């Protein structure tokens, strides 16, 4: 009685249901859902043209395209990107391919 | 009509549970016998396949 106590600020500790799974899968739904999202963005007609352009600008046809060929395809399909952003994203996805050129 | 004439006579509960357990055991025994026969056939086919692949080595040998 006497209305004594008490207010405690709720500091949410970071210990509630983290993804239980380490190093190959659980970060992948982000890009899979991105894959499902672009499916509404694009019609199937332009996908073949862009695949052809990728093949044209990927001289060694190894699924990997250097920065020069990447920018060549950018200009070919009207990918207007600053050099900084282009190289940033290219190296971002290259670090995912440390053993691939 | 026999609506309210549901006289559940005092059947031997021990006897009924024993009969149910025996039926379950017999069903499990027959299922295990069928599974053992299936696995024996699988093992025989696998042994024959292993021997006949050693023979396929011997098949190229014969060729």
């Amino acid at each position: 009685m006497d209305n004594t106590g008490k207010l405690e600020k709720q500091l949410v500790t970071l210990n509630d249901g983290l993804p239980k799974k380490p190093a190959k899968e659980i970060i992948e739904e982000l890009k899979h859902h991105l894959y499902q999202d672009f499916q509404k963005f694009f019609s199937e007609e332009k996908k073949q043209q862009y695949q052809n352009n990728f093949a044209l600008f990927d001289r060694d046809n190894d699924k990997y395209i250097n920065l020069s060929e990447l920018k060549e395809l950018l200009t070919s399909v009207n990918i207007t990107f600053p050099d900084d952003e282009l190289e940033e994203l290219y190296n971002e996805f290259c670090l995912t391919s440390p053993e691939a050129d | 009509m026999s609506k309210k004439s549901g006289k559940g006579k005092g059947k031997n509960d021990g006897d009924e549970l024993g009969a149910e357990k025996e039926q379950v055991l017999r069903t499990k025994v027959e299922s295990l016998i069928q599974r053992l026969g299936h696995e024996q056939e699988r093992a025989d086919r696998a042994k024959a396949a292993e021997n006949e692949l050693r023979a396929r080595l011997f098949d190229l040998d014969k060729d």
Binding site: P22, K24, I26, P98 | -
Partner: protein, 246 residues
């Protein structure tokens, strides 16, 4: 008054029994179970479909081990449907060793599971994973956003090109730790034609095999050197030549 968090059954359930159990699970909104391990219970296609249905309904199971459950390509397609990122079920571990769904079942899975983010570890030993199964393995491994640990294809049929594609994926892989390709027919040996008197043109005939073995060994070396996280490898039961092993 306790909840069945890990339904582990090792008796023959058959497709009908698996469907009945899994559909009773579906009809009872029971979200407490965190594992289902059917060891040769014969889940089969209908059981797999029911399991996918109730997993989609509940979204609580985390440790599924359908070993020798006769999961096929249709079951794998249903698994892809259920595990699609649109479903987001918490199943941590997936085991199907000796479940001969095949690489076609792998495709049926990847139809919606190509880029999913669930599993703790995927085991498919003796699942008949072929070279194009290793292609799907490359699809999975070449992804950087990663919260899985162990993908095992032991006892499969990866072979030289299977290992080649797997190491192509490893080249980009930065987070995978353990991989077991043992008993996969990884044959880096050139054969037994090393006696100079035995074959005058052995090298002339087997230069292609020598080159392929050298390429596979170079890829293996690169992946081992650059694998900060990939630190567990099982190349057992494979015909790896002495020079390649050294």
């Amino acid at each position: 008054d306790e909840n069945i968090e890990k339904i582990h059954l090792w008796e023959e359930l058959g497709p009908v029994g698996v469907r009945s159990i899994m559909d009773s699970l579906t009809e009872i909104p029971y979200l407490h179970t965190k594992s289902i391990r059917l060891w040769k219970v014969k889940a089969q296609d209908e059981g797999t479909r029911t399991i996918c249905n109730y997993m989609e309904k509940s979204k609580t199971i985390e440790y599924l081990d359908l070993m020798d459950n006769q999961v096929g390509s249709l079951g794998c397609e249903f698994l892809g449907r259920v595990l699609h990122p649109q479903i987001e079920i918490p199943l941590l571990k997936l085991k199907l060793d000796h479940n001969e769904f095949g690489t076609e079942g792998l495709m049926q899975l990847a139809a919606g599971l190509c880029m999913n983010s669930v599993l703790e570890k995927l085991s498919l030993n003796y699942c008949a994973i072929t070279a194009e199964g290793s292609k799907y393995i490359q699809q999975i491994l070449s992804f950087v956003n990663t919260n899985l640990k162990k993908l095992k294809m032991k006892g499969n049929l990866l072979k030289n090109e299977g290992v080649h594609q797997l190491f192509r994926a490893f080249k980009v892989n930065k987070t995978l730790e353990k991989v077991d390709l043992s008993d996969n027919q990884f044959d880096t040996t050139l054969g037994d034609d090393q006696d100079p008197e035995a074959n005058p043109n052995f090298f002339e005939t087997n230069k292609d095999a020598i080159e392929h073995n050298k390429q596979i060994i170079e890829n293996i070396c690169e992946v081992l050197k650059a694998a900060d996280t990939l630190l567990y490898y099982d190349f057992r039961f494979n015909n790896i030549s002495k020079t390649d092993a050294k």
